[PDB]
Amino acid sequence: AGRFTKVAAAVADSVVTIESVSDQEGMQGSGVIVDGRGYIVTNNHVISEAANNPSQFKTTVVFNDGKEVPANLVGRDPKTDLAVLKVDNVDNLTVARLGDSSKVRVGDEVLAVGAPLGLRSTVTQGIVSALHRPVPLSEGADTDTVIDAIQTDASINHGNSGGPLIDMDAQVIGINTAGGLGFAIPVNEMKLVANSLIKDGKIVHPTLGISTRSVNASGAQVANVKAGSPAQKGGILENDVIVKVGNRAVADSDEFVVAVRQLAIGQDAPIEVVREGRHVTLTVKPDPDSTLEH
Amino acid sequence: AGRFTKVAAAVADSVVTIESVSDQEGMQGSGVIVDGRGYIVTNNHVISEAANNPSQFKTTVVFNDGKEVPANLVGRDPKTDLAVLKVDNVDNLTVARLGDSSKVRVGDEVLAVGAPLGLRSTVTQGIVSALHRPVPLSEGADTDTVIDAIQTDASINHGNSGGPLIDMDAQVIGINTAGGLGFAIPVNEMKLVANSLIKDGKIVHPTLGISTRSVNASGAQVANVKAGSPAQKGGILENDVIVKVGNRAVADSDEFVVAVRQLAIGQDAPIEVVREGRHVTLTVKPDPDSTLEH
Amino acid sequence: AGRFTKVAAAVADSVVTIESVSDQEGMQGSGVIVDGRGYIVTNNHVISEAANNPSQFKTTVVFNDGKEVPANLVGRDPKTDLAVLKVDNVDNLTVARLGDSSKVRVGDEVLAVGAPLGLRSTVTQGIVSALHRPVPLSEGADTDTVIDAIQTDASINHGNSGGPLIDMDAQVIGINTAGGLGFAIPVNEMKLVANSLIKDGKIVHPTLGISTRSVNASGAQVANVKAGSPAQKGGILENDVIVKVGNRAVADSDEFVVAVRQLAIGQDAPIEVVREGRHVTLTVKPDPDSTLEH
Numbered sequence: 001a002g003r004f005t006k007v008a009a010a011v012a013d014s015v016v017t018i019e020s021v022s023d024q025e026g027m028q029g030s031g032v033i034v035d036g037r038g039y040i041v042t043n044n045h046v047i048s049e050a051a052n053n054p055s056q057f058k059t060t061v062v063f064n065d066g067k068e069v070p071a072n073l074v075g076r077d078p079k080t081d082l083a084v085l086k087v088d089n090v091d092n093l094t095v096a097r098l099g100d101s102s103k104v105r106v107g108d109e110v111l112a113v114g115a116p117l118g119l120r121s122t123v124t125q126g127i128v129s130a131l132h133r134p135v136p137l138s139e140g141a142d143t144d145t146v147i148d149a150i151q152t153d154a155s156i157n158h159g160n161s162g163g164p165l166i167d168m169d170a171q172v173i174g175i176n177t178a179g180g181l182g183f184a185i186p187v188n189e190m191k192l193v194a195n196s197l198i199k200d201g202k203i204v205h206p207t208l209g210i211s212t213r214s215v216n217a218s219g220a221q222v223a224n225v226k227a228g229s230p231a232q233k234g235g236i237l238e239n240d241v242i243v244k245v246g247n248r249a250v251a252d253s254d255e256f257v258v259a260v261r262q263l264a265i266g267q268d269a270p271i272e273v274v275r276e277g278r279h280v281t282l283t284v285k286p287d288p289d290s291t292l293e294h
Numbered sequence: 295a296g297r298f299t300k301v302a303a304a305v306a307d308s309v310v311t312i313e314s315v316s317d318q319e320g321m322q323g324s325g326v327i328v329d330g331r332g333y334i335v336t337n338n339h340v341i342s343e344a345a346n347n348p349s350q351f352k353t354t355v356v357f358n359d360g361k362e363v364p365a366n367l368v369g370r371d372p373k374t375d376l377a378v379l380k381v382d383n384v385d386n387l388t389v390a391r392l393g394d395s396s397k398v399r400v401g402d403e404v405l406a407v408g409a410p411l412g413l414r415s416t417v418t419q420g421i422v423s424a425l426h427r428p429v430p431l432s433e434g435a436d437t438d439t440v441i442d443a444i445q446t447d448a449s450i451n452h453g454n455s456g457g458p459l460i461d462m463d464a465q466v467i468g469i470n471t472a473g474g475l476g477f478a479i480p481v482n483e484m485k486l487v488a489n490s491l492i493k494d495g496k497i498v499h500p501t502l503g504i505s506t507r508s509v510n511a512s513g514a515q516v517a518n519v520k521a522g523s524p525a526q527k528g529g530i531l532e533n534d535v536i537v538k539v540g541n542r543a544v545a546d547s548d549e550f551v552v553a554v555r556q557l558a559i560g561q562d563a564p565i566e567v568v569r570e571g572r573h574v575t576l577t578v579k580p581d582p583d584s585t586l587e588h
Numbered sequence: 589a590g591r592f593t594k595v596a597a598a599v600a601d602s603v604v605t606i607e608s609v610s611d612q613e614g615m616q617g618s619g620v621i622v623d624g625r626g627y628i629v630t631n632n633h634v635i636s637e638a639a640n641n642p643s644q645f646k647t648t649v650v651f652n653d654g655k656e657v658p659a660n661l662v663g664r665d666p667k668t669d670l671a672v673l674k675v676d677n678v679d680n681l682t683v684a685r686l687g688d689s690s691k692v693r694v695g696d697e698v699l700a701v702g703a704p705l706g707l708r709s710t711v712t713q714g715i716v717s718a719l720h721r722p723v724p725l726s727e728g729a730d731t732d733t734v735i736d737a738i739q740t741d742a743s744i745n746h747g748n749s750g751g752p753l754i755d756m757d758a759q760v761i762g763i764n765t766a767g768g769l770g771f772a773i774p775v776n777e778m779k780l781v782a783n784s785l786i787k788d789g790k791i792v793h794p795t796l797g798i799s800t801r802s803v804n805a806s807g808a809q810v811a812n813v814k815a816g817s818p819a820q821k822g823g824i825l826e827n828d829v830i831v832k833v834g835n836r837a838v839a840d841s842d843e844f845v846v847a848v849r850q851l852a853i854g855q856d857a858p859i860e861v862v863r864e865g866r867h868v869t870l871t872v873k874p875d876p877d878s879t880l881e882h
Contacts, residue, residue: 002462004421005401024510106711107593107699111401119545122475123400124447125421127592127713130747153712153743155447155474159424168590180474180743180768181710216612251707296756298715299695318804405695413839416769417694418741419715449741449768453718474768 003168007111008123010170014096015163017062017115018042018071018085020050030115030163031061031085032096032172034194040085041194042162044076045179047083048140051076061087064116075197078142079205079261080189081177084197096164099171101150101186104128109168110152112176112184114160121163126154129181134254137179146257149183150174156182202293206263206286210236212253217274219243220256234284236271244272260286265294297462301405302417304464308390309457311356311409312336312365312379314344324409324457325355325379326390326466328488334379335488336456338370339473341377342434345370355381358410369491372436373499373555374483375471378491390458393465395444395480398422403462404446406470406478408454415457420448423475428548431473440551443477444468450476496587500557500580504530506547511568513537514550528578530565538566554580559588591756595699596711598758602684603751605650605703606630606659606673608638618703618751619649619673620684620760622782628673629782630750632664633767635671636728639664649675652704663785666730667793667849668777669765672785684752687759689738689774692716697756698740700764700772702748709751714742717769722842725767734845737771738762744770790881794851794874798824800841805862807831808844822872824859832860848874853882 001009018040020027029046033039040061050057051073061071069087076083108128114121130151137145150165150173161178174184196203209229212220220242225231236242242250245259246269263269263286271282288294295303312334314321323340327333334355344351345367355365363381370377402422408415424445431439444459444467455472468478490497503523506514514536519525530536536544539553540563557563557580565576582588589597606628608615617634621627628649638645639661649659657675664671696716702709718739725733738753738761749766762772784791797817800808808830813819824830830838833847834857851857851874859870876882 002399002402004403005399008401009399021510021512026510026512105590105593105597106704107596107713108590109592116400120424120427122423122445122447123421124423124475125401127711129710129712130708133708151710153710157475181712181745216609216614218609218614296693296696298697299693302695303693315804315806320804320806410694414718414721416717416739416741417715418717418769419695451769 004111004125007166007168007170008113011096011113011164011166012116013064013094015064015113015115016040017118018046018162019060019062020047020057022056028119029161030118030121032164033093034096034098036093036095038087038090038093039074039198040071040087041175041190042083042085043081043175043177043179043185044078044083044142045081045139046162047073047076048142052140059085061085062117066117075201077193077197077203079145080147080185080193081137081145081179082175082185082190082193084194097171098191099167099169099173099187101173101188104131104150104167104173106131110154110173111166112152112154112156112160112163112182113166114163118159120159122155122157122159124155124160126152129153134258135183136254137177146254147185148258150186152182152184154182155180156184200293202290204265204288204290204294205261206265207289208260208284208286212242212256214252215241217241217243219250220253230284230287234271235282236273236284237275241274242271243274244270246270298405298419301460301462301464302407305390305407305458305460306410307358307388309358309407309409310334311412312340312456313354313356314341314351316350322413323455324412324415326458327387328390328392330387330389332381332384332387333368333492334365334381335469335484336377336379337375337469337471337473337479338372338377338436339375339433340456341367341370342436346434353379355379356411360411369495371487371491371497373439374441374479374487375431375439375473376469376479376484376487378488391465392485393461393463393467393481395467395482398425398444398461398467400425404448404467405460406446406448406450406454406457406476407460408457412453414453416449416451416453418449418454420446423447428552429477430548431471440548441479442552444480446476446478448476449474450478494587496584498559498582498584498588499555500559501583502554502578502580506536506550508546509535511535511537513544514547524578524581528565529576530567530578531569535568536565537568538564540564592699592713595754595756595758596701599684599701599752599754600704601652601682603652603701603703604628605706606634606750607648607650608635608645610644616707617749618706618709620752621681622684622686624681624683626675626678626681627662627786628659628675629763629778630671630673631669631763631765631767631773632666632671632730633669633727634750635661635664636730640728647673649673650705654705663789665781665785665791667733668735668773668781669725669733669767670763670773670778670781672782685759686779687755687757687761687775689761689776692719692738692755692761694719698742698761699754700740700742700744700748700751700770701754702751706747708747710743710745710747712743712748714740717741722846723771724842725765734842735773736846738774740770740772742770743768744772788881790878792853792876792878792882793849794853795877796848796872796874800830800844802840803829805829805831807838808841818872818875822859823870824861824872825863829862830859831862832858834858
């Protein structure tokens with residue numbers, strides 16, 4: 001048995017097809033069993049259209065052994081392209097073994113696994129090619145976003161989006177997202193997000209009220225500041241060049257989006273700004289993006 | 295010597311360049327020696343233009359050691375993108391070792407080998423990423439087709455189309471076809487087809503008289519039914535949704551094309567159809583696509 | 589520690605980010621330390637714009653440990669897409685170990701390494717897929733060119749262009765160039781070129797005065813002959829089909845460009861030509877492309 005053949009075989013039972021249909025449309029993606037009670041993690045774009053049009057879409061989970069079971073949406077987070085599903089009273093679930101993405105190294109070998117019964121499901125091979133790489137992501141009326149991601153040269157496509165990125169111990173180290181290099185959501189973010197979606201059906205992310213574009217001082221140049229926003233109360237002005245958010249230096253607007261999200265809500269945070277040749281350090285207190293659930 | 299270096303080296307002598315030229319055009323592809331009498335398997339699109347314009351095209355086989363020998367066309371099958379060539383009275387042919395594609399597993403490592411002396415011939419590495427994956431294929435006045443294929447994440451391109459897909463035992467498990475994932479014709483189909491082309495210069499495939507498009511019941515929706523066709527005599531009507539052909543469930547029109555071909559000619563076969571909300575099981579007897587050679 | 593993880597880690601300190609900025613623009617690429625005095629090899633397209641606009645561009649070398657040091661241009665060769673930089677009085681440089689690209693085999697495993705601190709720097713894995721493969725290359729007012737290159741199925745992109753292509757002994761066997769297969773400049777050419785750029789700030793290549801396009805006799809068809817050129821004095825005429833230059837057969841115009849460059853300047857060289865159905869062998873003496881530095 002080949003070295004990758006064995007690892008691929010060992011997780012097949014933990015990876016499911018997810019299928020949303022209506023009267024005139026179908027979607028299909030991959031997901032992974034992360035909990036014996038029947039919790040399935042997939043990425044938010046796979047179920048996006050079912051979540052926005054629930055009166056017209058039905059969602060099913062098809063298991064490795066061909067069993068087909070109805071599924072219900074627990075929660076979703078368009079900002080990390082994650083989502084959680086739930087099947088009830090299904091026995092003999094093989095649960096995927098979650099790794100620790102803070103121990104992964106540039107150069108480790110990985111498999112990007114799609115669901116064995118997906119229409120065009122793929123399993124691909126490569127290495128980890130970069131870590132903590134911000135990447136933007138665009139399929140419905142959901143917001144665009146950016147994720148600190150794992151980069152790999154294994155192909156990530158429609159056939160394995162939502163499935164797991166797998167180390168050589170057959171451990172999940174990320175969730176593939178196709179929203180020729182590929183990217184996955186690191187499993188440690190996946191755990192935080194999924195933990196919060198299972199409890200509350202929602203996660204709350206920090207917000208500041210800024211829109212930025214990338215810059216020759218280099219960084220994220222402020223394009224617009226919302227009135228009443230934390231940014232306003234903190235003194236940020238248009239044409240300012242953000243170079244640091246909290247204790248994260250900021251290379252461009254993509255890294256800006258990610259840096260705001262790892263701030264604590266309602267705590268003071270330093271913002272470092274280059275303003276008409278002068279260096280300025282402001283202080284902002286991030287707002288929650290959704291005040292009722294907070 | 296590297297692990298792949300050794301396998302690549304061990305088959306180089308079995309892989310030949312195939313070269314079709316005229317007064318104003320050239321084509322070039324790869325082929326593989328499958329028989330000591332001098333039989334070479336390549337894919338049909340590599341020689342397509344020589345086969346349709348034989349008064350103007352000449353075909354040559356260039357061997358690993360630089361020898362250049364004239365070649366003759368034994369037979370070709372546009373429906374599986376396969377073709378067989380023949381060189382005469384060439385001694386010391388190293389024949390490729392044919393594997394068994396029914397023993398290949400998702401995850402096995404493979405090499406996709408082009409001819410060592412091809413202009414831009416490539417040798418690439420990956421794994422088997424899916425099995426029995428229908429794929430459509432489009433370079434002359436030949437019919438389009440669909441093949442139950444091996445999928446791999448090794449790159450398949452002009453530089454190794456027609457060469458062999460190779461396991462770690464240096465055994466041929468498929469024929470690469472470029473007609474970023476790649477596909478190959480599984481060696482077990484290759485054997486059946488080539489066996490029939492060497493004997494008869496032709497192969498006969500079943501036909502039904504249907505054209506289909508993919509479907510929300512899901513499957514292959516009937517777009518047109520030929521008059522006098524087996525489909526007519528069997529009761530198939532336009533707007534019917536084929537969901538099963540023989541004992542093969544049918545996911546879309548691509549899998550429909552492949553499912554018809556593994557039917558026996560002139561034997562009764564069940565077709566399962568969804569017709570105005572009702573499920574219907576018809577009975578058709580496939581015709582040969584070419585009645586004289588049958 | 590994974591097998592590739594170890595090799596990647598072992599060269600990280602030899603690979604630097606190269607950064608050219610102005611008032612309104614930035615470029616960024618990878619380079620590699622090839623000499624303890626502080627010599628860095630990168631490819632010419634990474635620094636092209638700084639070299640043509642030196643009054644407005646500044647060039648910096650950022651090391652693995654975050655240190656940022658000014659850099660100066662030693663010499664560059666657009667014809668091989670190579671360039672040499674120099675940092676002064678930097679201690680504890682880990683110098684990259686140069687391999688021998690004449691010992692590399694089709695099938696060897698390789699890593700294509702970008703600088704660890706590059707914005708979007710990548711590290712990718714594959715095999716050597718072909719050797720001595722001419723490839724054309726196009727980012728400023730620099731000439732286009734063609735290089736006898738190493739081909740690999742490791743991805744080569746903006747994130748590792750200029751970095752090293754690495755064998756499993758952690759030895760540099762080529763310089764990646766992004767000017768889905770990738771190509772690198774073989775390390776043995778890199779050594780010759782860099783040796784000459786460090787001494788003279790220039791390299792002199794042979795020239796003949798011909799422009800060609802590819803051909804049904806196959807080869808490089810002569811499109812134009814400069815007046816006074818070596819080609820003129822040697823008898824080459826338009827519509828001639830060059831099939832051999834020196835002792836290198838010539839498949840197309842791309843291989844023509846490369847074959848001229850390995851000729852000796854000012855020595856007689858045979859050119860083989862097909863002219864109105866007849867085979868003709870001419871004699872040309874290549875001129876230097878730059879007569880003062882010669």
